[PDB]
Design a protein around this ligand. Structure first.
Ligand SMILES: [Cl-]
Ligand SMILES: [Cl-]
Ligand SMILES: [Pb+2]
Ligand SMILES: [Zn+2]
Length: 86
């Protein structure tokens, strides 16, 4: 639900240990897919590697519905809370 999505977006900021870059990109990609939906931008160029990594994570989810990305985002945050603590 929307209230669960809001709770998860808050709780993920409070993990006691920083998740891996892969976990952080799962969170970023699904957050975008659950809100904007399919990627609507061009991949960052030049030396913006942080931007390219985020873009690639969101691009891989093209086709996923907002509702399914939201559910996966919430589930991942709950997984991260159990893994790292809050
Ligand atoms: Cl890193
Ligand atoms: Cl589904
Ligand atoms: Pb579905
Ligand atoms: Zn907070």
């Amino acid at each position: 639900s929307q209230a669960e999505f809001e709770k998860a977006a808050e709780e993920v900021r409070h993990l006691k240990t920083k998740p891996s870059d892969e976990e952080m990109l799962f969170i970023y990609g699904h957050y975008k897919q659950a809100t904007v939906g399919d990627i609507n931008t061009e991949r960052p160029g030049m030396l913006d590697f942080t931007g390219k990594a985020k873009w690639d994570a969101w691009n891989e989810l093209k086709g996923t519905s907002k509702e399914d990305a939201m559910k996966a985002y919430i589930n991942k945050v709950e997984e991260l809370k159990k893994k790292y603590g809050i």
